[PDB]
């Protein structure tokens, strides 16, 4: 949603449009949502009880 | 080696050959004319390969690819086919174009007959300023390609 709804001349956009450094997922964790942490193919298993 | 694990990159090497000898002032060639201009060069490359049999001498020209007499090289002669049955794709596109643009669509080499029928005088000059204007193949434009 961010890529089509962010203005041009945006620095995390303009260096992810290139292959300089970053991705379309790296900027998305900085502005919108960071996702769910995985642990070796497991979605944070239970600690106790 | 170049892309797709082949040492050619036929598409880029075509345009690199095309731009270096591009001239509208030259004449151009016919679809059958380029194939004999091609086989002038890669022809004698093929007869330097001898294809001996498993015992000393040669094998008979009939039934060559029989999975018994594959000698120490086969991709080298296959590469000469791989360039041959590529550049006829450039030939068929010119043959398929001039057919539907009013001119006689010719791809076969004509026999020993009235040489230089030259359909310039047959069709009007709008066709000569149509076929040669879209795309064209000069005689040097193949001798620097292969």
């Amino acid at each position: 949603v961010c890529i089509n709804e962010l203005d041009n001349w945006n620095a995390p956009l303009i260096m992810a449009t290139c292959g300089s450094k970053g991705s379309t997922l790296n900027v998305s964790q900085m502005v919108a949502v960071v996702g769910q942490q995985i642990i070796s193919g497991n979605r944070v298993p239970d600690g106790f009880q | 080696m170049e892309g797709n694990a082949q040492p050619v990159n036929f598409n880029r090497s075509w345009d690199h050959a095309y731009n270096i000898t591009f001239n509208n002032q030259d004449k151009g060639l016919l679809p059958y004319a380029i194939m004999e201009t091609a086989n002038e060069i890669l022809g004698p490359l093929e007869e330097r390969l001898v294809r001996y049999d498993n015992s000393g001498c040669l094998v008979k020209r009939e039934d060559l690819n029989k999975a018994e007499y594959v000698d120490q090289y086969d991709a080298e002669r296959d590469f000469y086919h791989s360039l041959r049955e590529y550049i006829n794709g450039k030939a068929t596109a010119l043959a398929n174009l001039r057919k539907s643009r009013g001119m006689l669509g010719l791809l076969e080499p004509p026999a020993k007959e009235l040489q230089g029928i030259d359909p310039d005088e047959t069709v009007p000059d709008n066709v000569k300023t149509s076929v040669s204007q879209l795309y064209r193949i000069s005689e040097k434009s193949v001798r620097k390609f292969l």
Partner: protein, 140 residues
């Protein structure tokens, strides 16, 4: 007069400044011919355009209108009558690709140093060779 290789009058269709700020792509529609039309990129910070507007499109070559061992480029002098002293916006570029759209419909590709133009004709545009130089010639 012998230098004009193409001339028509088109009405534009829409103007799209998609994700830019100083270069926008315009559409065209011929109000005289019913077949040809073009696409083109126009800097509108020195040549403004609006949709549903009619202008002059002209493709000539060697605009000196008649007739220093440096291999460079130099501009013409101050007092010099020439072609397109009456227009508003001329450009520079080369042709690179000639291919057919359909039966008796061919596409012509100019590139003005990244700025593109794709139009199509019906062998009306016979004069336009695959030349090195070509100028566009536009009044408002």
């Amino acid at each position: 007069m012998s230098n004009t290789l193409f001339d028509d009058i088109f009405q534009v269709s829409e103007v799209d400044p998609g994700r830019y700020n100083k270069v926008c792509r315009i559409e065209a529609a011929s109000t005289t011919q019913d077949q040809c039309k073009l696409t083109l990129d126009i800097n509108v910070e020195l040549f403004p355009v609006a949709a549903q507007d009619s202008l002059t499109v002209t493709i000539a070559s060697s605009l000196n209108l008649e007739d220093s061992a440096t291999r460079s480029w130099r501009p013409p002098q101050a007092g010099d009558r020439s072609l397109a002293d009456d227009y508003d916006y001329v450009m520079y570029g080369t042709a690179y690709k000639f291919e057919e759209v359909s039966k008796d419909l061919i596409a012509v590709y100019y590139s003005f140093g990244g700025l593109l133009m794709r139009l199509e004709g019906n062998y009306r545009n016979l004069n336009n060779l695959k030349q090195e130089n070509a100028y566009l010639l536009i009044r408002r």
